[PDB]
Design a protein around this nucleic acid. Sequence first.
DNA 1: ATACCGCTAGGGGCGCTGCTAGCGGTGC
DNA 2: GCACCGCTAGCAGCGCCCCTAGCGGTAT
Lengths: 52, 52, 50, 52, 50, 51, 50, 52
Amino acid sequence: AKVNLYISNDAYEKINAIIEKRRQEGAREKDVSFSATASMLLELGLRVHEAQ
Amino acid sequence: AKVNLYISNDAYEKINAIIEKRRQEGAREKDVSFSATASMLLELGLRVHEAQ
Amino acid sequence: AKVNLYISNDAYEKINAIIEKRRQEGAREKDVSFSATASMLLELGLRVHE
Amino acid sequence: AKVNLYISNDAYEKINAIIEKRRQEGAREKDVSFSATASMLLELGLRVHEAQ
Amino acid sequence: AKVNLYISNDAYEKINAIIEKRRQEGAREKDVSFSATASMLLELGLRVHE
Amino acid sequence: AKVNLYISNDAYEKINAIIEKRRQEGAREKDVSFSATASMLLELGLRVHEA
Amino acid sequence: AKVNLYISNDAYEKINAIIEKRRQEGAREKDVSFSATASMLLELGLRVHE
Amino acid sequence: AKVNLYISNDAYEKINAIIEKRRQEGAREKDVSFSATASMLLELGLRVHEAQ
DNA sequence: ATACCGCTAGGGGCGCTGCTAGCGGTGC
DNA sequence: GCACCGCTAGCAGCGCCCCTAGCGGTAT
């Protein structure tokens, strides 16, 4: 599902900060895309939302 | 920051499920947009990512 | 083309008056936007000007 | 009342075409602005909308 | 040559409408694919363009 | 509607040949895209198919 | 990973026999493909091998 | 019967891992091919599928 | 038989771009 | 008032990519 998010500059830089760590530890190039890692954080926030 | 996310159909429906709850409890129409609530979940996942 | 118009309060209320009629007769919500109906009136005034 | 209109490129050029005629016949510079002439055409379209 | 086309919903449904006719008259399954029939219509439009 | 077409090399080159003419006569860059001109030819073939 | 297997005619027919059962119980067409169900049986044989 | 399978990278590496063990214990070269050992695992999975 | 190479045929990711729409700010 | 700029919000075009699925060929 294609989705447009309008996030803060802080959140944007923090996501890029993660990807640069992944690509430094690993990683398969273009496997750790922006859409992937950000969607990974979204679903992560979803499972927490159900907890509380 | 304009951002394109490509999420699962499950995640998409769950986000909409939240908005329908918000608009039923509250809410100011168009204040609880998709981009807002999803970005809210993203930043929520970000603060958790740091905890580990 | 994004355009800024500075119109009278009368014209503004009359345009809103139209939209409220459209949304009462029809209409598809957000299909009869302010920008749309006002641009519709502009082009209407253009064809008359010719 | 400040208003945002999103018009066609044809309509945009035609309005400018008018202003260039006005400023060539007359005119007081900045008196025949874009906002003015376009609002003049809007109200013109309004009075026609009623007659029908 | 692999090609991405972004067509209207009308055109999309009309192409499917054709395939459902072909598979009802004939047809060899998967022989009348979407890519085939649509490419057939493209080349058809090409010869007309000339 | 996103669609994958697998066309001949002849058809592919002919479509590009058209775009190069458009961009030489006109044209607004990226307005005469591949997807656009090819979809224009598809719908053109559709209206003929009905006739 | 694209892989070529050269299996017995018995194994081939048995795999097809499964798919025909799946498509009769369910199923989403083309979701229960040959490659899928056969790869499902391969991984099944892998976990047993361990 | 010639057959195309599209398997996971994990499954692919595990099959190769087996062949490297066979060729180290034994084996007749090219007798323990990829197609053979993988088909051996398939039929193995088939006999299990019937048992349950 | 084995393992490689093509090829249509679909599908979706990915990141950029465009757009309409309404909100605001800036400096003249 | 004027004409630019910015921002969310949502939609989709655009062309690339990788993937599956199944079909064929090929030379060891």
